[PDB]
Symmetry: D5
Subunit: 194 residues, 10 copies
């Protein structure tokens, strides 16, 4: 597919299950002006997937409080989504959700983000960070049996915000409050001494 | 490029700067039987890059002790690498290294991992986790101004090792010692009670 | 797609939800020697679909008693199927099933039977009658809002069986016990006096 | 051929034998505003075919009374049609007809409906339900030795009319007077508890 | 099409209505060793056509007695042929036939003799004279409204036979018993004195 | 070549030997408004050919009197034609001619009427009847050793003229004064009874 | 065409009119071991052409005495050739011939010698000198209205023979008995002094 | 190459050595209104070539006096030409020249006249006669060891001039003062009586 | 690549390390009106390369004083360049530079000058002399182990300036003050007497 | 063309003027085991060219004594070469030569070394250094008006010989007896200090 860093994120406009239980088209352009964490998962009613989806749903506010939305997506229909929502978490369900979930029934969205597993018809665990101008800035794809880390997605969004705001550059392992540096041969000396 | 999850990692055999200061060809097939974290950076003598490279070098043992090697790569010559190694960390140098650094002068390696930034001739911050059978299992690419997290690379390697060892599946945010589950509708019920 | 009357039905070998609740590959060649009614529906957890699926499941024996199996198929995963099976009929579920249901996640089966609705990613209400030599003998496709008739499927299977057994031809509206005729200019005269 | 559900039915304008014994061009666009049942048969002066053609002719009014026309078609010339019309039913003829019969001498119409049997030069038993906007809504194709059912064609036309009139969806085996349901997760509950 | 003088006549093997009222495949190679007059007509149950077909049937013996068979062909089915045969001549029928009539339902035979009228799907009035080695020696094609002349076909066959037998050449308007000449500058002088 | 019935005859404009012994271009469009019999022969100074050419020359008037011209054509130059004209008939010459003879030295005309015998560079005995609108209505091609019949050409022209004038159709063997019929199922009955 | 100096002359094998009035195939390979003057002319029964043909025929012996044959060729048939031969020279005929004349009816020979005038279908006045190994050594082509010179053809053949025999080179205007020179910088000095 | 009789001679515009010892571009269009004899030779400082070149130079006036120029051409540079001009004839030089000599260093001119000997990079002894409208009228090409005849070139130019002036045609061996004839069947008879 | 003599030098506009230690785009068009010596070297921090670069830097003024700039280029980044500049010459560094050094990180500039060594990703020792109209006048490429000569580059620039100023031509080994000659057959004689 | 550094030099086998005044084929493979300086010049009888050719001829021994041959080449014929050799140096000639000179009449050799000036048909001043294994090691091409330097060619050959013999690398301006260095980061320090 079609997703390249520092190019416009592949556009989409697709039916999604909204937090209030309704079906509505969600378009990438509706997130213009915001950061977006778009993430894919393979299949409704499975195993790693609800742990990830529920973690992002429970913690949406950590993202919304810094101007970042989150959006989930899989191959399943809206109706599968809705049904999965109607089962309690203790039975492997989702319960109530605070994030929308796209139903990529044609699989065109996952194809364009380059995360289709062709042999099975499902998405790999791709996560993408899209900025307010709608350009792609970070790509993460896990094989199916290993879940992603929500704290790391949050760290990345924060690091990217920081870079836009201050024109500085974020070192390895950067967390809010750590030292950063200007990407300049002379001014960077301040970072490297002590 | 042609790096796809669960397919053989694109093969390479290229000159590298070795820890002992010599130049030697390093071939992907040398790592057969081990896990490998292969990571790219844009340019010698810059800013984020030495913070990442030095972190992975300082912490190699955390990776070796669990059967995982680490390898770095950039567009620069082996002579640039060596020179950079000869400058102290407090002046923006690398100092002594415990990991090899490939010199991808033809750029064929970064092209094949899909992390060339064509307009500039440099690699994005791509990091790849390759398993002992030499298949690619995890892809991570950051835009240039935001550094990667070594603790997260380690978590992922561990999670993948855990999955291969026990046939179980690793939930969101999994750290060694957390609960896992069997990817089966019936047996997964045990997990969803907690 | 490539489903043509009197040619071999397009071959498939895909995961299915079996009546006993397990997952197993079901291959077209496993029905060699039997008649098969293969039928597609658009989406799990919807409206016309369970009324059809349940009718075929309740009445399997009418088909099995005369050497004819029945097989259902949709775009949804095995896991969606299983979940739907776990909801009671009076809540729009399937309950226990006596028929397998294929999970055509790659959509290759529906593509090959020519019943994909490309814009939505779902199958039209296609029903196919395949004979013991595995050749396709009857094609039926409804638009989504109108359900199929199980009595008419049964009539067709019986008519095709009757034709293979006796070398006669089945007139319009034929039911078991009605007059048939030999497809011969002279011998047909008997039928037409009436 | 190119007959697809919910696309415009393939257009035609061809010589037909009319009920009054004359020859006239009949164009698909003449049926705009009506439902149309278009049906093909292999050969004049054969066996299943007159039983089907006569049934549809005898019962045209059941179709006209509900705003649906019927049209027949085969590979034979107008002159064969006319001749067949001049033989009495008890000798295997058609007698007087109340429906037109197209003479698809070039075979372009059957090609475009996808019901040509290339090896023999004849049409399979294809039956198509076209709506007033001239979109195709139902496809039925039988192998040659098994006739179609007129009552089932009628049921389908009625079901489709019912759906257009009321915005409801017709379950399996639906006949006029049976319960229907709204294709909505919440409003469909009324159907399933009763 | 590909009928060329002095090349093998395009081969065919097709269902025909035989004089005795049965259906049988007739193959061009059956006529090896004989002369053949193959002739096409547009449509069963029409106007010029029966006058030609009946003339050739009545007069077959004039052709058989000199080692020449005759074969008719049209686009219509065997069943049309048979039906037409069952109507008396005074009602525009054929009555009993002494020649076989091919049913070129796929139209492949007329295509290959180059006498298809594409717009209508029917054959022009093509007549072809094929020799015992199965090479084509004479081509005649009339537009539909003008019938052919049987006496002229007979003249041509006789002329061609005469030429094979004696190595002489047949002048304009030659009839049995007229002067012929050797195709030699010197020996032809005998003809031209008269 | 590209001569097809009911299509414009292939156009030509070529040097011809005129009756008065001169050379002039003769163009197909010159014959607009007339019937034309165009006929080809293989070679000047040969055997069948002068018998045909002389017969058509002697009898031109039978054709002119009914609005039909005649034109001859061969591969030879105008100078060969002229020379052949200068030899008396009793020595195998043509003598004085009342018809023009085209000199198709490039062979483009015979190629386009489809009567070139490629291996020898000469025309077969092709004869074509072109109507006043310049459409081709009748094709006749004989192998070289058998001459054509002038009376039959005349019969055909007359039959075609008769059909244009009266809208009737000419049966097998029709001669002026024989019964004809209207090509209509009802009105044709009068021909077939008595 | 394909006639190139010092390459094999384009091969031919075609019907010719022989001196004794018979028709025979003449093949280029028949002249192996001899010199050959092959010459083309546009049309039998014309103007320049017989003056050339008759000159070469009258003077054959001047050529045959030095091991050189001569062969003529045009677009006309053998029968035109023969006829032209039968007219006396004083009436523009050829009379008796001592050279064969090819009849290049397909025009393949003139095409291959590159002397076809496409617009007219005739050969230009091409004359070719072919040596005993069958390689082409001299090309001469005149526009139609200017005849060739026989004495010059003879001079050329003699010059080429002289060159084969002695390994010397023939100056401008060379005639038998004139000075020649060795094609060597030193030995050529003898020619250039006195 | 693309030199064809009666087509425009291939155009050229190339450096030449002029008679006065200077270098100047000579363009074919400069000769418009004149006859031109263009002749090629293989190599400066060789053997046959100076005998030809010197003959044409010595006898230019025989050509100029009748409105015909002459132009020479070879693969050699203008400097080779000049040098050759500086050596006396008695040592194999050219001496003073009255004719320009083109230096076809790119070989494009000889390629276009079709007289390149590809294996050696030199021109064959091609001579071409171009008329005042710049059309090619006569082609002569000799293999390298045999020189051309200047008298024959002159004869040809004269013959062509004669034909353009009087509309008559020049027989074999024609010299000024010989009988010519009108190219007309009737008027040519006067030539053939003698 | 596409560098050809007397064609425009391939255009470039690329980041360079300037003498004052800054990074700036340098475009070929900046040198319009000057002579330019553009020279490539394989790799920063190597062996031959600094001896060449330092020689050209030390001696820039010898080039500037005569209207000629000099520009260096390699595959390495601007940061490698800057670093190399920061090491003293006696440790293998460059020290302060008086010439800019391009950083051809995409390798597009070396590709277009045809000096890429594809297998290694580095430039050969290519040196190019570009004139004030920006046309390429001199190409020099050494294999990697042999350095170029600065005095030769200077000699060439001077020779080319001399030629442009005086319209004379520079002999083998020419140094300022040596004899030159006019490129004219006559005027060159003065040079060759000595 | 296809001359590339460190690839086999383009092969040739062509007529040359040898030192003793004879013509002989000279093949590149004859120089296997020796160094070769191959050099091209534009045109015999010109201006810079003899100064270069004479200077290489006078100084051949400086090259032979160190195992290096020299070979010259131009577009002109052997005969031009020989002639130029016959003129004394004081008149712009070559006199006696000690070096062979190829006559690249087809221009295939200069094409393959990439030094053809297509518009003029002549070679640029290309000079190539080929090693004993026949690989190309140095390319030099001057525009026409500036001659090359023989001392620099000699310097280069010596430098390349030195490098092959000792495995060291030759700095800028290296002359026999100057300091060289080992191409190793550590061992090169000896060169850079003092």
């Amino acid at each position: 597919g079609d997703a390249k860093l520092n190019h416009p994120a592949p556009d989409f406009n697709e039916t999604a299950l909204m937090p209030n239980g309704t079906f509505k088209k969600v378009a990438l352009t509706s997130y213009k002006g915001k950061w977006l964490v778009l993430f894919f998962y393979p299949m409704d009613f499975t195993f790693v997937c609800p742990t990830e989806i529920c973690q992002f749903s429970d913690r949406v506010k950590e993202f919304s409080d810094i101007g970042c939305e989150v959006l989930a997506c899989s191959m399943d229909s809206e109706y599968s989504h809705l049904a999965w929502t109607s089962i309690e978490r203790k039975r492997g369900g989702l319960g109530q959700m605070n994030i929308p979930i796209l139903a990529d029934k044609t699989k065109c969205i996952m194809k364009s983000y380059g995360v289709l597993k062709e042999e099975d018809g499902v998405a790999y665990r791709g996560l993408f960070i899209i900025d307010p101008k709608q350009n792609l800035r970070q790509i993460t794809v896990n094989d199916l049996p290993v879940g992603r880390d929500v704290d790391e997605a949050l760290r990345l969004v924060k690091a990217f915000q920081f870079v836009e705001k201050h024109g500085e550059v974020c070192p390895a392992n950067w967390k809010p409050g750590d030292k950063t540096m200007k990407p300049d041969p002379e001014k960077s000396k301040e970072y490297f001494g002590a």
